[PDB]
Amino acid sequence: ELRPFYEESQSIYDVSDEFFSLFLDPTMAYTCAYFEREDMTLEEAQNAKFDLALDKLHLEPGMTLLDIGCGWGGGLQRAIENYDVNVIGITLSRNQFEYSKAKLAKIPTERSVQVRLQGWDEFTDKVDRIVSIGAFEAFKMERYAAFFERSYDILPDDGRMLLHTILTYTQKQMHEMGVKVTMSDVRFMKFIGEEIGGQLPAQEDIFKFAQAADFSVEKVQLLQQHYARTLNIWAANLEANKDRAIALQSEEIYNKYMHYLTGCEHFFRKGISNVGQFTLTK
């Protein structure tokens, strides 16, 4: 599929933070929200999702929290505001690195706050607790063991990790559950492969890889229909801001984002995909 002439093309990965602000909530969370109350706004549900993850970590004053894949910094903002802990956030996105650094610098704190442009395989600092929301689905399966081994090694004896990631099912499970994958679903999976690399883990894969690194899985919490609602709102916001999206980028880029959001929404609504928070203990 390689073309003989290099072509500087327009990718969904080239859009600015301003483009994401057309459809994310004000905290710029780009992961599944948690509608703990049915009438929550998107921002309230994103706050609730971060608070849900952080509460599972049993943070105590003075600890250091690592956020692997800190995104646009909403999780660490909640951690700094609500806990008396030092924090380290890592991301490999330069835009997210600068955005999160500037966002968190505005927050009063009596603890240390660091944001780094760094991947987990470069990270060796000892930390007390780890949160990772929406990063694992960008990892290649051949790196899973190394990821859990590194996570285990940087935690203390009492360490805890909250891993939040998207999940798929085996065909046997889908047949059992009465989920019928159609040609249009197949074409959407092909679109994902062409625009987003790799397959998605099943719940059982996370159990297997975590336990092989000597973690215990104490809890899995599944948020399937919360993601369907999250994606619905994102797509509605982007459509409301369609003219501005097209002016910043193009109708092609607008269409690709809308196709992505609404196709993913469908996969959660129909039951092809899920999303889980895994509490891992050492």
Catalytic machinery residues: 264
Q: Say how many residues touch Cl ion, by CB under 5 A.
A: 4
State yes or no: 276 annotated in a binding site.
no
| Stretch 114-173 residues interacting with Cl ion (CB under 5 A) | none
| DSSP 8-state secondary structure symbol assigned to residue 127 | -
User: Rule CB under 5 A: is residue 184 a binding residue for Cl ion?
Assistant: no
Binding mask 1-40 for Cl ion (x = CB under 5 A): --------------xx--x---------------------
Check whether 128 is labelled as a binding-site residue: no
Q: Is the CB of 94 or the CB of 172 nearer to Cl ion?
A: 94
Residues 126 and 154 sit within 8 Å (Cβ to Cβ):
yes
Q: How far is the CB of 252 from Cl ion (least distance, A)?
A: 13
The SS3 of residue 273 is strand
Report in angstroms how near the CB of residue 17 gets to Cl ion at its nearest.
8
129 annotated as ligand-binding? no
Restricted to residues 45-64, the positions that interact with Cl ion (CB under 5 A) are: none
The candidate with the shortest Cα–Cα distance to 79, out of 105, 45, 116, 104, is 104
92: its two tokens: 């490999």
- State how far the Cα of 276 lies from the Cα of 101, in Å rounded to an integer: 28
Structure tokens given for 83 = 């806990």
244 or 259: CB nearest Cl ion = 244
In the chain, how long is the greatest CA-to-CA distance? 58
Q: In 3D, which of 34, 132, 117 has the Cα closest to residue 79? A: 132
Q: Is residue 62 part of an annotated ligand binding site?
A: no
Residue 95's contacts (CB-CB under 8 Å, 6 or more residues apart) are 16, 17
Q: Annotate each residue in 221-260 with x if it binds Cl ion (CB under 5 A) or - if it does not, as one string.
A: ---------------------------x------------
- Kindly tell me the number of DSSP H helices and DSSP E strands found in the chain: 11, 7
Q: Which residues are documented as binding site?
A: 30-31, 65-73, 91-96, 120-121
Q: Residues marked as binding for S-adenosyl-L-methionine?
A: 30-31, 65-73, 91-96, 120-121
Residues that bind Cl ion (CB under 5 A): 15-16, 19, 248
